[PDB]
Amino acid sequence: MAKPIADDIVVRQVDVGETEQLMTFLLAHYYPEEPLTAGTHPPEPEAADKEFLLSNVPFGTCFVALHEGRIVAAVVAGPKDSHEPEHMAEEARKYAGGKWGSILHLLSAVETATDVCRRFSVPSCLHVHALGVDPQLRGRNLGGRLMETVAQRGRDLGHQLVSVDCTSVYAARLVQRLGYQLINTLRYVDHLDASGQQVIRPPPPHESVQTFVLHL
Ligand SMILES: CC(C)(COP(=O)(O)OP(=O)(O)OC[C@H]1O[C@@H](n2cnc3c(N)ncnc32)[C@H](O)[C@@H]1OP(=O)(O)O)[C@@H](O)C(=O)NCCC(=O)NCCS
Ligand SMILES: CC(=O)NCCCCNC(=N)N
Numbered sequence: 001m002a003k004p005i006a007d008d009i010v011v012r013q014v015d016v017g018e019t020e021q022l023m024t025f026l027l028a029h030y031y032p033e034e035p036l037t038a039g040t041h042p043p044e045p046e047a048a049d050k051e052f053l054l055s056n057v058p059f060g061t062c063f064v065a066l067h068e069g070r071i072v073a074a075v076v077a078g079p080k081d082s083h084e085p086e087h088m089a090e091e092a093r094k095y096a097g098g099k100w101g102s103i104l105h106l107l108s109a110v111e112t113a114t115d116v117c118r119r120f121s122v123p124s125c126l127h128v129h130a131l132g133v134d135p136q137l138r139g140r141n142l143g144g145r146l147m148e149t150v151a152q153r154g155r156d157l158g159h160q161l162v163s164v165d166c167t168s169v170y171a172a173r174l175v176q177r178l179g180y181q182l183i184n185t186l187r188y189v190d191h192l193d194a195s196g197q198q199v200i201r202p203p204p205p206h207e208s209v210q211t212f213v214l215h216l
Contacts, residue, residue, distance in 0.1 A: 005065070005145050009072065009137075014062040019054045022064060025071040026053065030132030035167040035202030036103045036209075039188065046100040053130055061126065061157075063149050065133075065142050072137045075146040076130040079159070082117035084127075102199050106191055106209065107165065114184045114211050116163050125213075126154035128164035131171060143174050155216050162214040167202070172210045180212035 003011040014022050031037045031045050056062050056078035065073035088108035095101035116125050128150060133142045147164075154162050164180070166172035172182075187208045188200045 003149065006140065006142075008067050009142070010066045011063055011145065011149055012066055013060055014057050014064055014074075016058050019057055021071055022057070022062070022074055023050055023054060025064070025074055025134075026050075026076075026130065026132060029134050030074065030130055033168075034130075034132070035188075035206040036106060036200050039200040039202035040099045040102050042099065046095075046098055048095055048098075049100040049103065052100075056129060061150065061153055063146055063153075065137075065146065067137075072134040073142040073146055074130070074132055075128060075143075075150055077126055077128045077150045077153075077162075079124055079157075080111075080117075080127050080163075081124050082115075084117070085112045085115055088112075102193070105193065106186075106200055109191065110165055110184060110186055110209055110211055113186065114163065116161060116183070116213060119183070120161060120213070120215075122160040124159055125161040125163050126150065126157065126159040128162065131164070143171070144178055147175065147178055151214060151216060160216050162216060164212055166210045166212060167206060169205050169207075169210075172212065175212045175214075178214065180214045182210055182212055184211040185209070 001013050053076050056076050059078050061077040063075050064071045088111045092104040092108040095104055131143055151162055185208050191199050193199050
């Protein structure tokens with residue numbers, strides 16, 4: 001289970017029992033700059049946030065790029081069906097009040113608005129939950145290579161659609177280059193909590209979460 005790319009970079013599937021290295025990479029080079037995480041407080045993700053990402057590892061849909069045994073890029077993906085809008089709404093309620101609750105309330109608003117299984121009459125979708133590249137390796141299409149790996153895994157699994165919430169404009173530009181289509185835009189200034197406070201305040205240039213899909 002190894003796909004050589006680039007120079008000394010190999011793409012591998014994250015194995016159940018190797019999640020610590022993946023989380024260490026995510027905490028170093030994904031979470032500090034990911035707009036929802038950077039736009040909420042404290043800077044570090046809560047346990048439930050990290051645990052949800054790692055809950056996708058058993059699906060075989062999580063991949064890393066390795067260089068000298070070190071993870072330099074990672075993608076986390078998992079399945080969803082037409083019940084996901086209801087499921088995410090309930091999960092947002094469960095964790096309301098914390099950093100993860102704020103992030104989930106935005107992600108759940110987006111899932112309700114996109115509702116891709118009903119929108120495209122497909123039974124399921126492979127959703128990309130996280131994508132990050134070491135800053136020293138950015139601009140070498142490692143993100144695109146990992147997204148292509150996910151698409152092929154989706155094809156093998158019978159999914160007819162891949163979806164991804166590009167909270168970052170760099171990810172939006174990447175998936176545009178891959179031929180994904182935009183299906184939803186939610187501006188961060190437009191998303192409040194029940195008390196009227198803006199939930200996510202991310203650094204510019206990230207002004208919106210843009211959801212893209214790819215038909216398989
Ligand atoms: C999103 C991400 C994986 C894209 O990285 P990537 O695949 O290497 O990006 P690309 O190969 O498409 O690079 C295209 C150009 O955009 C720039 N670019 C990519 N990400 C950038 C970033 N955070 N900041 C500034 N410029 C960036 C590249 O450096 C490159 O330009 P250059 O070669 O002239 O310098 C990366 O930005 C990242 O890890 N961000 C932090 C976590 C995050 O926000 N993930 C996505 C949430 S949707
Ligand atoms: C592909 C991608 O990275 N999308 C952004 C997801 C939002 C952040 N998720 C968590 N903080 N758990």
